[PDB]
A paper describes a structure:
They are essential parts of ribonucleoprotein (RNP) complexes and are actively involved in various steps of RNA metabolism including pre-mRNA splicing, mRNA degradation, telomere replication, histone formation and translational control. Members of this protein family are characterized by two closely spaced, conserved Sm motifs 1 and 2, which adopt a conserved Sm fold that consists of an N-terminal α helix followed by a twisted five-stranded β sheet. A common characteristic of Sm/Lsm proteins is their tendency to form a hepta- or hexameric ring structure.
Attempts of crystallization of full length [name] failed due to the poor solubility and low yield of the full length protein. The structure of SpLsm4N was also determined by the SAD method using the data obtained from a SeMet derivative crystal. Residues 1–11 and 72–91 are not visible in the electron density map and assumed to be disordered. Consistent with this notion, our structures showed that a possible arrangement of a dimer of heptamers, a trimer and a hexamer for SpLsm3, SpLsm4N and SpLsm5/6/7, respectively, in the crystal lattice.
Author numbering:
A (entry chain A), B (entry chain C), C (entry chain B): 12 to 71
Write the structure that this text describes.
């Protein structure tokens, strides 16, 4: 799966296309939908980098 | 009004063009300017979805 | 310099090309990389406005 959904420890989720990932799960997503715990969303974030340490889980 | 300004309960404002609104005031804005309570702004957010429950008021 | 790095009092940094600055250090950056204290980043923010009162320091 290039499109993945990443849930952060802070409760946010990022839904985007996987561009890079390293052995520590630091990763980059493109064309991202960011969903807040309160239900608000932001669409079409060009690119987001997420530290492996900040991730709760990832679903493909 | 297609361009509207939405002020959230968390103090942020979103200024963009109205794309959709439902009977619960869940709405979508495009080409949005987001203003933080501390004055910082982010321009040209492609699309934001805001839950009616998170809105304080809307100005047209 | 046009590319500058702005560190905010809230610990975030904004790395982008300087568009405007005023005598109070309210400024505008374009094509910006926003880095969070926890190491997550957002790339290619079209434009950000930052209030002088929110800035800790600026590096060119």
């Amino acid at each position: 799966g290039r499109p993945i959904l990443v849930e952060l420890k802070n409760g946010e989720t990022f839904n985007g296309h996987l561009e890079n990932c390293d052995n520590y799960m630091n990763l980059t997503l493109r064309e991202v939908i960011r969903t807040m715990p309160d239900g608000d969303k932001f669409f079409r974030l060009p690119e987001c980098y997420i530290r492996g340490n900040n991730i709760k889980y990832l679903r493909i």
